[PDB]
Ligand SMILES: O=c1[nH]cnc2c1ncn2[C@@H]1O[C@H](CO)[C@@H](O)[C@H]1O
Ligand SMILES: O=c1[nH]cnc2c1ncn2[C@@H]1O[C@H](CO)[C@@H](O)[C@H]1O
């Protein structure tokens with residue numbers, strides 16, 4: 001359960017960070033699939049390894065620490081989160097929650113997140129961007145909701161509503177930007193269902209998920225979104241369709257993370273460009 | 286998680302309470318959405334803080350109590366202060382008060398809760414008698430009974446057949462009918478969302494299509510513990526809000542309207558429970 | 569009280585067992601419903617009580633690893649299972665399967681008792697698992713949650729052909745050619761963490777999710793076996809017809825489940841023996 005994502009600990013992390021950068025983030029960006037280049041494209045960047053932030057949860061990519069990247073992107077002050085805390089890795093709720101709440105105290109108003117997901121919706125193609133317009137939080141329905149435990153009233157209410165969790169205006173903007181930049185055809189909106197993971201969904205599971213009205217399935221993101229919505233950060237989330245979910249037990253096609261990475265790699269340039277352009281048009285200063 | 290809800294710990298809590306009161310409750314009541322609590326005759330109000338190894342509620346200036354007394358001539362114990370799983374309470378913490386009730390002599394547990402109305406035919410303030418449930422956390426390996434079975438209390442694999450005693454439901458309906466508010470009463474399937482987030486429109490749509498009538502974040506664990514130890518159950522959801530099914534609507538479930546609709550129906554709900562208890566069969 | 573199912577701990581346990589037996593099993597069998605007499609059929613057999621295997625999970629009459637030969641093949645039979653509804657950890661469930669891997673197991677055959685959701689199912693039917701819905705898994709209680717043990721498998725295992733189709737085809741042919749093809753179905757097994765039987769509403773929902781049988785086990789081991797590359801054959805004995813009607817008097821009862829399983833145990837044993845008999849030998 002790392003350090004409790006309470007106001008005390010979150011403030012402490014926040015203040016440590018504020019020592020290290022003069023950048024007050026307006027936008028938090030959770031680097032998921034296809035956003036690896038975005039991270040690297042931050043201007044006047046300050047890079048703060050998780051290992052350099054006391055009480056910040058620790059995650060590593062093959063022994064390399066995740067980083068907090070501060071700077072501007074499309075003229076906007078941002079904090080890019082490079083290194084996420086997936087529940088399938090065993091991370092506790094407080095661990096996932098803390099970075100988001102730190103973002104809150106840091107000044108973040110809008111969280112943008114990407115992920116890789118399997119396309120349940122049969123109209124989806126590989127490489128499609130599915131803007132999350134809603135989610136089904138299977139772990140949350142089953143008592144693994146990231147918010148289970150004492151509510152941190154400092155951050156939000158005991159029973160947050162998740163109405164407009166995926167800010168409809170941000171979604172309208174994102175679609176708009178895709179349309180204007182000639183890749184609206186790649187952009188869909190859909191329901192993202194979280195499979196706790198880390199197993200890919202079996203065909204029966206995919207078939208069930210599809211029947212439940214899920215468009216894409218992934219193993220991430222929702223808990224972050226919940227914490228974000230809980231503390232009043234607006235959320236924009238896109239799933240990169242990194243594979244078409246197999247609904248048929250007899251198919252020899254099988255999901256594999258290498259192809260997920262491949263699709264993320266191939267769509268990273270467009271996704272970055274898209275996020276940069278969305279950000280450029282975020283209504284403010 | 287402070288104490289395993291086994292026969293020894295439970296017996297100890299029961300025996301302690303029995304020093305504190307001579308009332309042997311036949312009916313255990315858990316009020317989620319009165320007021321009833323208030324109107325129990327000759328009440329002995331025992332704070333949880335007074336009961337060692339009994340779960341203790343979070344504060345807020347309102348510690349929970351076991352209220353013992355008579356309602357409609359019947360001996361009852363009212364549980365004021367519930368332990369909801371979304372709070373991070375453990376299985377043992379939720380189980381124990383119910384098993385305590387068993388030892389104290391509770392034969393019937395009556396529970397109210399607030400729920401989102403999934404069923405489109407429902408309106409705010411409606412009462413949905415639970416006739417069945419979908420225990421999503423239970424299915425997903427968070428069943429309150431997960432762990433060593435406490436044989437003192439019940440079987441390893443409890444059937445949840447007639448879990449919402451059909452006779453109690455029939456009586457409850459009859460009573461609501463006889464008292465001019467039968468039109469408010471429905472029966473349906475309660476699905477537990479572990480919570481504490483309200484359900485997204487997509488979740489509600491999924492829940493509705495799973496055959497769920499109302500959704501809430503409580504009750505089932507208690508019901509499971511009760512049925513496991515053979516307490517009959519009557520449970521009703523007050524539809525404190527209509528679940529929003531599509532993401533377009535401004536919508537928004539809110540604990541405020543929960544308390545509101547709650548209050549609006551609190552005296553009816555309490556009246557109903559009293560009148561039901563009035564007509565329960567008596568040994 | 570739970571040792572990580574990592575390569576170190578699993579090797580220690582495997583190596584220990586290897587100093588109690590020289591049977592290198594190629595087939596692991598996990599005794600569920602209808603299995604139990606299976607051990608009797610095992611020849612040149614050594615019983616190894618779990619109590620005798622350091623760091624091996626311990627279970628109620630302590631469970632046993634039974635090594636030996638069945639239908640001309642080296643098998644290890646796991647007698648005594650670790651069910652998540654008992655409170656056992658993922659590591660407890662995972663370790664024996666991973667031990668089997670190290671011991672040389674190529675094929676895991678498993679039976680369980682299940683409620684028959686599919687309305688065409690009869691009591692005592694065999695439903696070969698051809699797929700599953702791991703409700704605990706979707707809900708963040710997947711046995712693999714935690715650091716991926718790379719010695720065993722990949723971070724994100726696919727569950728494609730989890731229920732090896734060739735094993736399933738063989739199983740069916742054996743049933744068909746031995747006069748009980750009519751007892752044999754294939755279906756989707758959904759795991760209810762349990763230990764409560766499914767309410768009528770739940771069964772109804774599960775049926776509508778596309779589930780044929782419901783039980784409280786098996787999937788975790790299947791997931792661990794698929795993760796480390798063990799092929800899986802799994803059969804649910806329909807030990808009761810799930811009740812979908814909340815107005816029904818019929819109810820699941822474990823005594824009956826045990827009774828129905830015990831009744832089919834002989835046929836289930838014969839089936840497994842005959843399947844093994846026909847397994848490709850290299
Ligand atoms: O089809 C899929 N099912 C579930 N999660 C997926 C799928 N495709 C991509 N992801 C996501 O990408 C990584 C695993 O490859 C995970 O982090 C998961 O969230
Ligand atoms: O629409 C709903 N979804 C889930 N729980 C609800 C809903 N309406 C009422 N409750 C109940 O109200 C409390 C929070 O207000 C929760 O404890 C829940 O059980």
Ligand SMILES: O=c1[nH]cnc2c1ncn2[C@@H]1O[C@H](CO)[C@@H](O)[C@H]1O
Pocket residue numbers: 442651680681682683684760765766782783784785807808810820821822825
């Ligand atoms: O109808 C059922 N639902 C769930 N599990 C079942 C059912 N029938 C048999 N089992 C299995 O047998 C034991 C309980 O009797 C459990 O271990 C469960 O996995």
